[PDB]
Amino acid sequence: MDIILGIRVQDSVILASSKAVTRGISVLKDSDDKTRQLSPHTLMSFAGEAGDTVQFAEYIQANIQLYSIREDYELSPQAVSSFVRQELAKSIRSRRPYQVNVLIGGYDKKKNKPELYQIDYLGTKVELPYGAHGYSGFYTFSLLDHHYRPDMTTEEGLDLLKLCVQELEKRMPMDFKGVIVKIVDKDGIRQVDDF
Template sequence: MESLLAVQGQDFVLTASSSSAVRGITVLKPDDDKSQILNSHNLMLYCGEAGDTTNFAEYIAANISLYTLRHNLNLSPEATASFTRKQLATSLRSRKPYQVNILLAGYETNLGKPELFWLDYLATCVRVPYACQGYSSFYCLSIFDRYYKPDLTIDEAVRIMKLCFDELKKRMPIDFKGFICKVVDKDGIREINI
């Protein structure tokens, strides 16, 4: 019952992840952060099998850090998405593939533009203006379709996220215990309250 949401604005990406870790009908942890900071301008949100998600997120973060140390260069969001997709594709061809779905939000500092990528456990990677993973996609994609525009401001994006949260509260039979929302922009990654 995990949900990931993200929307790209004119100079930022706003992300949200459900904050509860649930197994069956039991809430294991009400404040689980399903995001991993990869570098100063790349953020990965993940959902899927509990062990796979944490293991894969830490593996990607460690390899991105290693690349930065070796080459003294931060990977762009597109390069990070490409590397992550390659790791998922390699895993898919193994005996024990990772069961993890990802939203990768980043800010390309050289070009001065935000980027958002949608990746799934089959190693599909697509650049998108807005995205959902998990059960939220059943209800929130139509809201994004209706209200999204390329030059969104942060206030407009927050309003769209609130509409999504309200719809999920209305339609879903479980309580997500809230969402952890983060913004990726030219200043880096920061958490915000919605």
């Protein structure tokens, strides 16, 4: 797991999520997609404890997909983030809590705004222009503090993201085998395939 980033720009939200899956002294895989589509205009990336991450993600996915069918409607990114937070908030006082951190990047069609939510395993939600989980933040937050502007284009956002990845590839101790990048906007979710 480890590295998951998100940047919200003018018209979209961009999630970068590292591709490595390490266990012990072996990198078991270098093309892992640490994400799930919750609805046509909602993406969730995740990092944390082995097993818990995918189990939690897929569980949330199924619930949102169930809601969509029942109401023939797509929940707002805010509503989905509130649902996810509550699930994590419940989990933290369970017998065995999910140790999963998520980023929720969605485009609200009613408002025509992109939205980025950062939520940790404790159920701590915050809406942000840019976000990161784990050690990533110790490098990327200050870098974006400097370079980010609120009215950037999807293309400027990807350059800003390159800067983040370059810095992490320079200073982070572990080889995270790069990132998969996805864009969430008025037209839905698509994947940049050459990063």
